[PDB]
């Protein structure tokens, strides 16, 4: 397993797409922080440190939109789009001035800074850059 | 079909003579003292070595030697002689 | 030596100089050490001469040499006023 | 130089009334009143659907032929307007209207821009006192555009200036008749002028 962060983002993407209540990802402090942001921005209901067959996990509680009318009644996702930017194959770092605006503000960039994991808004306020972890909307 | 470049060339051949003359003379008396010092013969070495140093700094008055080249040449002379007289001694005069 | 003089800028029949400190051996419009003012011999504008008098006096002090018609213009800016 | 040829055929092709002569433009001897169909052998044949390119070409030529201006100067002005700050459409029209030969015409010094050009060119006009015989001069806010006092006793300017006594002049201009002089108050809105022109279609033409 080469990229835990990308695996987590992907675990979520796969779950939401078939409308699971929650999903479990193997736990780490750095993942919590990302989820912390994810919930506080309302992309997820939240998470809790659970245990699967003896192992520390993170149960991520998924959130969607209202049922829809028409032929396809499946509800709009809250997380339409989540994908890694920086990867083991190519690390991506921006300075505060190079921090992107995801979807004109309608989305968020998550970054790891020397002040911790922040959104693009947060990073810009604190005036620091960092490694561009991923983007969500 | 002509110039004062001609004049400059004539002058260079006269300055050429004098630079070589002094430089030869310096080289002669330098090695001479060094030869004496080798079999030292302290008083004679230093006597000649005093004469070399004079011709050196005198060369550095004009275009013959740059001051640093003079300094360099004196240094090696005096360094050589002292180290040579050190096989036997004793330095009968100056300097220093 | 290092000199204070007029490097021509501008264009044809529209002379515009930068009074400048540069090595004498430079080409006239070549790289200069510092600009210490401009000069518009045709007075097409209200201020057709400016001289950082502070800087100019420094170069003078440190051994620079003005050209004749630079020293003229430098005089008009009162660098030599005691 | 400028187009310098038959001018009714221009309105006829353009399918709209362009006022390129002055007097006859309001008469029944106007060609658009007599034959409101394109010049040449095929004017009265039924038009087929104009392509998008066709449409935008025409809209641009209209705007152009209005001012009697070269496609070169036209394009340059446009290019200036595009890189210029703000909104290209207005700025383009504004810069167009700031041409001396144009202002001279908007002030009623002449019945047409063609005549206005010959006026400017022949030095019969001045800007803030100074003689300017260049049609391309960009008049700026606060400029006095006057008849040359050495030319003030000219028949044509008189008859033209007589026709302007209380005649309204665009909000952006002011004319002091009898004194034979006018002023440029500010650069005109797209709104402040009603050219038979969708200037967006011109933008689209030059973006091809």
């Amino acid at each position: 397993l080469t990229d835990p962060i990308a695996d987590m983002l992907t675990r979520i993407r796969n779950a939401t797409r078939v409308y699971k209540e929650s999903t479990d990802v193997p736990a780490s402090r750095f993942k919590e922080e990302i989820l912390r942001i994810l919930a506080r921005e309302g992309f997820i209901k939240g998470y809790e440190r659970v245990d699967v067959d003896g192992k520390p996990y993170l149960r991520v509680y998924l959130k969607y939109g209202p049922r829809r009318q028409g032929p396809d009644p499946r509800p709009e996702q809250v997380i339409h789009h989540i994908r890694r930017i920086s990867k083991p194959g190519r690390r991506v770092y921006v300075g505060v001035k190079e921090i992107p605006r995801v979807r004109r503000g309608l989305g968020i960039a998550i970054l790891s800074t020397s002040k911790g994991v922040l959104t693009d808004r947060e990073a810009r306020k604190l005036g620091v850059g960092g490694e561009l972890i991923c983007e969500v909307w | 079909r002509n110039l004062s470049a001609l004049k400059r060339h004539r002058q260079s051949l006269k300055r050429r003579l004098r630079n070589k003359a002094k430089k030869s003379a310096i080289k002669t008396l330098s090695k001479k003292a060094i030869q004496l010092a080798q079999e030292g013969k302290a008083e004679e070495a230093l006597k000649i070595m005093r004469k070399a140093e004079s011709l050196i700094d005198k060369a550095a008055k004009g275009s013959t030697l740059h001051k640093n080249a003079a300094a360099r040449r004196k240094s090696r002379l005096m360094r050589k002689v002292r180290q040579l007289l050190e096989a036997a001694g004793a330095p009968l005069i100056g300097g220093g | 030596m290092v000199k204070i003089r007029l490097a021509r800028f501008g264009s044809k029949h529209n002379p515009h100089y930068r009074i400048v400190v540069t090595d004498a051996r430079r080409k006239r419009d070549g790289k200069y050490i510092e600009k210490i003012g401009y000069y518009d011999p045709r007075k097409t504008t209200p201020d057709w001469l400016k001289v950082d008098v502070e800087r100019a006096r420094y170069w003078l002090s440190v051994g620079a040499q003005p050209t004749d018609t630079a020293r003229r213009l430098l005089r008009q800016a009162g660098v030599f006023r005691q | 130089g400028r187009y310098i040829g038959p001018v009714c055929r221009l309105c006829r092709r353009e399918g709209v009334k362009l006022y390129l002569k002055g007097e006859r433009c309001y008469s029944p001897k106007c060609a658009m009143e007599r034959r409101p169909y394109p010049p040449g052998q095929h004017g009265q044949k039924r038009a087929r659907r104009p392509s998008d390119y066709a449409v935008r070409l025409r809209e641009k030529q209209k705007l152009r032929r209005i001012y009697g201006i070269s496609e070169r100067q036209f394009r340059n002005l446009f290019e200036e307007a595009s890189k210029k700050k703000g909104v290209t459409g207005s700025v383009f029209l504004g810069l167009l209207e700031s041409r001396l030969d144009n202002v001279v015409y908007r002030l009623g010094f002449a019945v047409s821009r063609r005549q206005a050009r010959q006026l400017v060119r022949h030095g019969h006009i001045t800007v803030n006192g100074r003689r300017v015989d260049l049609p391309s001069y960009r008049v700026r806010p606060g400029d006095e555009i006057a008849v040359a006092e050495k030319s003030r006793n000219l028949e044509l300017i008189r008859q033209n200036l007589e026709a302007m006594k209380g005649r309204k002049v665009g909000p952006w201009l002011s004319l002091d008749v009898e004194g034979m002089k006018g002023k440029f108050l500010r650069l005109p809105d797209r709104e402040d002028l009603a050219l038979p022109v969708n200037e967006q279609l011109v933008i689209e033409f030059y973006s091809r």
């Binding site: 194959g89 190519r90 690390r91 991506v92 770092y93 | - | - | -």
Partner: protein
């Protein structure tokens, strides 16, 4: 300031001279990924006190020989034969790369 470099001593077969391999990292100018490049500097060792496998600092210096423009500054670590071997294994692999 004089440039100061850190690296491993990969050769000491020279009199009063050691060979110091130095590594540097940087993002690829176009493809962004961080990549490694290395370079060997000839280092002045007047005491012949520096042994194979020593991590040292070398400092930019007035020419000692053609190709020697660095003195060894100070010892940093010792016994890094593990690094020395990666250098040697690659050179060793080169016989396999001919025809």
């Amino acid at each position: 300031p004089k440039k100061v470099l850190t690296g491993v001593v990969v050769s000491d077969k020279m009199q009063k001279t050691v060979t110091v391999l130095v590594e540097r990292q940087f993002p690829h100018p176009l493809y962004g990924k961080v990549i490694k490049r290395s370079k060997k500097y000839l280092a002045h060792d007047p005491e012949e006190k520096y042994k194979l496998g020593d991590v040292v600092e070398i400092i930019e210096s007035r020419p000692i020989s053609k190709r020697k423009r660095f003195r060894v500054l100070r010892l940093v670590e010792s016994g890094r034969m593990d690094l020395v071997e990666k250098y040697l294994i690659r050179r060793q692999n080169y016989e396999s790369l001919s025809k």
